[PDB]
Amino acid sequence: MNINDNLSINSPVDNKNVVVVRARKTDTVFKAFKVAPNIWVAPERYYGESLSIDEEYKVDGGIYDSNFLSQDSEKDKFLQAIITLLKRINSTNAGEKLLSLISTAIPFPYGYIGGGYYAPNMITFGSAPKSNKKLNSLISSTIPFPYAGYRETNYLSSEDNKSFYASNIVIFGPGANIVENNTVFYKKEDAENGMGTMTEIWFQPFLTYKYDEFYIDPAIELIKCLIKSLYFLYGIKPSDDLVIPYRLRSELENIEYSQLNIVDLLVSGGIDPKFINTDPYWFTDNYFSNAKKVFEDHRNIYETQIEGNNAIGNDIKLRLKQKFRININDIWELNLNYFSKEFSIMMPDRFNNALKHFYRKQYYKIDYPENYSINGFVNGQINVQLSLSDRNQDIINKP
């Protein structure tokens, strides 16, 4: 893996590394810069969420501003920030492995137009000219008619709907809420059925916050977003109703619980997963069995059918192989604790998904070629001099 660091917002649209594609099937287009195999960056804000939300719908502890990432200078700064974060992740062996897995974990392609992953049809072309004694009508060349006809679902379509670019991850900007990193799938049905789906990430690399006596490295937030995206890429996404009891709301006068989705628990790391991922397991659902069975079915489909087909390309056949090399338990047992240990990054460790209730966050601005670098925060995670962001006054407070 090698991050393409030679890109900028002023680069011309060459339809190979800088493209202008259509957002889903709406009327809006956006620019996209490919920074790695099947990894793209969209330096503008997200398109799905309206940037001017009603005041009655703003969430607590969120900086709402409909002017961020509007000028080309800010867009270029965002692009360079994402490049720097990706390069920092790629520097360590574990980060490089995660990025390689993200790049190679394409969603499972569909079959032929008639169904199936076996051999395609055949067609004969180019009959040789008639000789003086032989008709030579059958002296031709046989070629597979629908060569590489497996209809992949991970692609961005150009504004003309005539050019298509393969892509697994698109890193947009933040949506309506500036400080809210999010990971959204492209298709729910293909994300929950073991097939796989495209993933989009809303990331805010310019604002961090202080916890205890250290600043949060945005690289770890990006790593968490990538790990959560790996769930969508492999199609192992549990139903939204699979939640666990996270915290008891002691501040209230009634017995109520705040619950967390199992994906967030399995990705966020910390100490909470240690109380569920126990040997033997006390918490088990049919989701794990179904996911393992569907993954085994798809691996068998690749091994017996999509492997011996000599009429599909090694651009898919050989990524599917690498994608199915790993097991599901590898994805499930992959959380932020491992990357924190391998990166020596200090992160919130108890109830990190409920830090809004415990204390109010103060946000610090990050200038990327001033404070962050290829090796992370300058002068360590503690002794880095970061100025408090002027947006702290705009944090909406709804008790």
């Binding site: 076996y118 051999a119 055949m122 032989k134 008709l135 059958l138 000599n310």
Partner: protein
């Protein structure tokens, strides 16, 4: 009504079986005014399923297992899509209608009691297709027999292959080591176990059987006489070392057989899958101590036959024994390979005029190889401490073609070696006089040693008269201190290869007392030359004494000096025994 003993029998009725009522289900095409039309299909999976007609005694599993045991394995063969196509040009201006149907292999399993068939089950395996054509006019009535088939029938040879169901030399002058032998191409299995299929072409038509490589899965075959050391993985590794065979169970190489029948009679084409045969042999002391056979999938074989006369009765012929038949050209290519159980040392610096290599302790008295290259083309004398042990020299085949770094050694990792000279007797006293080229990697095989004394292998660049003994192994004779007769047995070299014996005549040097020396051999015939040898500071000065001798049972002697040190060079021109046996009869 059959003429076989009681029991159960597996019967194959041949190819080209067209079923009833299944005509005109794939369709047909109409052409006219001399227009060429082509129709083809693809037997891949769905239209390539068997038809089972079982019996209470013969269930589906039973018939399938017996058929696949004796005859072609249709389950693993139908997985590979095989294509076929027919072409038929129209005549002068009359409309021609052609239609395509399937052909099957009929596999009957019968229960013979007394000498009457009391029970039978049928298996139809889809093989290929068949095109039937007619010439018609608008409004002309066509016979119903052309369109609709009432009963199953065979459009090919009336085969009947039955098998009863049972309720259960040559002198090789190669040196010791491992050899991979390509024994040829075109190997098919008996009893049509490899038959892609038969295709019948009518007069004035063309037919083609094609493997489009829509699936790369191929099935190699492997047999071994010793699975402990010659396993399938081991044989594949040795084949990769010898012939650089990359893909074993995967192939992407289309092959197509096309035949145009003459416009007077029908013709038939049988397409088979073939195999390339590789024998990995472990050869020690002039005998094949181990052998493994690997059949790599080749690109098929086409056989052209004529339709037999319909006025001929069937003959119930038993199947042939399990074996292979070679249909391609006679080929036998032998390539020696490096034993993987022996470690390989390296000499990165190119060998100059002089170099001495000390045997490392990591060897710990084990046979091994040393890899070396020589800076300048020339004749080198390679020996060890007092010419012990007898060491062999090889030459990596194809080395020096790709990489180059002057004055250094580039390890090309070539495991295919060509034997140059040497002996396999560790107690023999000899030194090699070989010719080394500027840019070739060479291997020196140090044999098993039974001593704790460290050894030194010395390479000396010889520019004197030792160029006479090019590519030879000078064998030192030291136990010659009496009269009578002596015999020395060595590994005989191949034809047009050289061996040498350096000896000394008992008695002091007095320029007199010319003893009678009779040098001959026992089985092998070789041209012998004698030299006198004069040792100087720079080396040896060969002095010609006799040339163009005939050692095989020679009865001539030479009044030759005593105390002198001579060299006899033998070029074997006739290989009759694996071991050469030089006899020296010395008399006063």
């Amino acid at each position: 009504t059959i003429d076989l003993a009681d029991g159960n029998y597996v019967v194959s009725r041949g190819d080209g079986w067209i079923l009833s009522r299944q005509n005109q289900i794939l369709g047909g095409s109409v052409i006219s005014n001399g227009s060429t039309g082509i129709v083809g299909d693809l037997r891949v999976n769905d239209n390539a399923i068997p038809y089972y007609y079982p019996t209470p005694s013969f269930n589906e599993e039973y018939i399938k297992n017996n058929i696949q045991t004796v005859f072609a394995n249709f389950t693993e063969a139908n997985q590979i899509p095989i294509g076929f196509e027919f072409s038929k040009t129209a005549p002068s201006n009359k409309n021609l209608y052609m239609y395509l149907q399937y052909t099957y292999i009929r596999y009957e399993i019968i229960k013979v009691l007394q000498h009457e068939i009391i029970e039978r089950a049928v298996l139809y395996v889809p093989s290929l297709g068949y095109v039937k054509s007619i010439e018609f006019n608008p409004g002309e009535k066509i016979n119903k027999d052309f369109y609709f088939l009432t009963n199953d029938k065979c459009i090919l040879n009336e085969q009947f292959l039955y098998k009863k169901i049972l309720e259960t030399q040559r002198v090789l002058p190669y040196s010791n080591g491992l050899y991979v032998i390509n024994k040829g191409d075109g190997y098919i299995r008996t009893n049509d176990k490899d038959l892609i299929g038969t295709l019948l072409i009518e007069a004035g038509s063309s037919g083609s059987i094609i493997q489009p490589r829509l699936r790369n899965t191929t099935r190699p075959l492997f047999t071994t006489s010793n699975d402990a050391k010659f396993s399938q993985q081991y044989t594949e590794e040795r084949l990769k070392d010898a012939f650089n065979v990359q893909l074993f169970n995967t192939s992407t190489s289309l092959f197509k057989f096309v035949e145009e029948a003459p416009s007077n009679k029908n013709i038939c084409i049988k397409a088979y899958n073939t195999y390339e045969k590789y024998e990995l042999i472990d050869y020690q002391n002039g005998s094949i101590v181990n052998k493994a056979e690997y059949y790599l999938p080749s690109l098929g074989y086409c056989e052209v036959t004529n339709a037999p006369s319909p006025e001929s009765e069937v003959v119930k012929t038993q199947v042939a024994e399990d074996g292979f038949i070679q249909n391609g050209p006679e080929e036998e290519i032998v390539v020696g390979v490096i034993d993987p159980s022996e470690n390989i040392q390296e000499i990165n610096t190119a060998i100059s005029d002089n170099y001495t290599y000390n045997i490392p302790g990591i060897v710990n008295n084990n046979p091994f190889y040393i890899l070396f290259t020589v800076n300048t083309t020339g004749i080198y004398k390679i020996n060890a401490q007092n010419n012990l042990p007898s060491l062999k020299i090889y030459e990596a085949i194809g080395s020096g073609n790709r990489n180059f770094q002057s004055g250094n050694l580039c390890d090309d990792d070539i495991k295919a070696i060509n034997y140059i000279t040497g002996f396999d007797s560790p107690n023999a006293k000899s030194y090699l006089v070989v010719l080394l080229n500027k840019d070739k990697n060479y291997y020196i095989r140090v044999p098993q040693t039974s001593s704790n004394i460290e050894n030194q292998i010395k390479f000396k660049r010889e520019e004197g008269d030792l160029r006479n003994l090019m590519n030879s192994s000078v064998n030192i004779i030291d136990n010659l201190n009496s009269t009578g007769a002596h015999y020395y047995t060595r590994q005989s070299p191949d034809v047009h290869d050289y061996i040498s014996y350096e000896f000394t005549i008992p008695g002091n040097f007095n320029n007199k007392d010319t003893s009678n020396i009779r040098l001959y051999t026992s089985y092998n015939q070789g041209i012998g030359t004698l030299f006198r040898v004069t040792e100087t500071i720079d080396g040896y000065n060969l002095i010609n004494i006799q040339q163009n001798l005939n050692l095989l049972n020679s009865t001539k002697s030479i009044r030759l000096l005593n105390g002198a040190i001579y060299i006899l060079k033998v070029e074997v021109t006739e290989l009759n025994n694996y071991n050469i046996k030089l006899h020296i009869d010395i008399t006063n």
